[PDB]
Amino acid sequence: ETIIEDKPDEELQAELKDDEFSAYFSEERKVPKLLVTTSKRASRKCYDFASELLDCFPNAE
RNA sequence: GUGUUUAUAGCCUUGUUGUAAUACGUCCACUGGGGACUGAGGACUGCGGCUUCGUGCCAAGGAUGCUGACAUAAUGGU
């Protein structure tokens, strides 16, 4: 029963309008700034994939 | 060209001028550099040399000291 129906729900929208992600979906339009890091003492194999993940997301550090 | 005997060169031989020098052989428990490989052992003993003596010092029963570079690298293996 947790499946969201295609018909818009006012309870679901009331929850989201002041949610943790509300600053992104509101008229404020908070530009997302990403911080990608790894685990401690990672190898170059992790960096070759992290660089690709860095290409996917602009404005990511 | 023929024969000469220091001539306006000198050569050799001989004793001989103050002695030598040099080369070769040999020796120094005399000495100054360059290069390479090794560092086994692992408290102390020992034999020695310095030292007035030294919990002294030393090249004396086997390497120590001073540095520099790297973790996303350096180094080696398959």
Side-chain angles (χ1 to χ4, degrees):
Chain A
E1 71 280 26
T2 63
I3 302 264
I4 303 302
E5 274 297 317
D6 281 337
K7 189 261 293 151
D9 180 65
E10 97 286 353
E11 190 175 14
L12 179 72
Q13 295 306 118
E15 265 205 328
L16 300 180
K17 66 127 160 183
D18 290 314
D19 230 45
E20 317 91 36
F21 305 98
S22 55
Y24 179 91
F25 295 95
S26 85
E27 69 267 10
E28 175 187 348
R29 299 242 319 193
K30 175 61 188 310
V31 173
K33 197 178 181 188
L34 261 51
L35 177 57
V36 182
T37 177
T38 175
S39 60
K40 287 158 182 165
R41 238 189 275 268
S43 64
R44 214 41 182 201
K45 303 230 64 53
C46 204
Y47 292 107
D48 301 321
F49 176 76
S51 84
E52 283 260 49
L53 253 187
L54 259 280
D55 261 354
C56 262
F57 298 105
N59 278 336
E61 301 283 329

